[PDB]
Amino acid sequence: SFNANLDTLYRQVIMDHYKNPRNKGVLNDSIVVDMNNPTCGDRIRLTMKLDGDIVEDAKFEGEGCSISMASASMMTQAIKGKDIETALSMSKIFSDMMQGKEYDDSIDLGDIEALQGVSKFPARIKCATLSWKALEKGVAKE
Numbered sequence: 344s345f346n347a348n349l350d351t352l353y354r355q356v357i358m359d360h361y362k363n364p365r366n367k368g369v370l371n372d373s374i375v376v377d378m379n380n381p382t383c384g385d386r387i388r389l390t391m392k393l394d395g396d397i398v399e400d401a402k403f404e405g406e407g408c409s410i411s412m413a414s415a416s417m418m419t420q421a422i423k424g425k426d427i428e429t430a431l432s433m434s435k436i437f438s439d440m441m442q443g444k445e446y447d448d449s450i451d452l453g454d455i456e457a458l459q460g461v462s463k464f465p466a467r468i469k470c471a472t473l474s475w476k477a478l479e480k481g482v483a484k485e
């Protein structure tokens with residue numbers, strides 16, 4: 344069916360980020376945040392190189408389900424070059440998309456919109472948010 348094909352296309356984007364992750368590794372001279380989601384057993388180490396308040400670079404290492412690792416990939420791709428304020432606005436928009444609301448759709452959220460499917464399964468919301476919590480934890484360390 345058509346809804347099925349659209350779901351499959353979304354899923355193919357998510358699997359592209361899971362099997363072709365962006366920004367894998369660990370940055371030198373960076374903020375390091377470790378974060379884990381015991382409710383799925385996902386763990387991530389996010390590093391961020393900030394130029395003042397500009398996300399100059401962001402990498403992650405980790406192990407978890409397709410959702411958490413794909414979300415980390417999409418987040419690192421989406422926030423690079425943005426200021427902290429914009430990254431946090433993107434985090435709030437993503438949270439709203441996760442909660443099922445009408446999120447702000449006039450700022451570059453890139454690949455992240457494929458993760459809207461996950462609002463359908465509440466238990467998987469934690470997977471999708473792991474990286475963003477690390478991001479927030481990262482930038483509340485100034």
Ligand SMILES: [Zn+2]
Pocket residue numbers: 380383384385407408410411469470
């Ligand atoms: Zn998970």
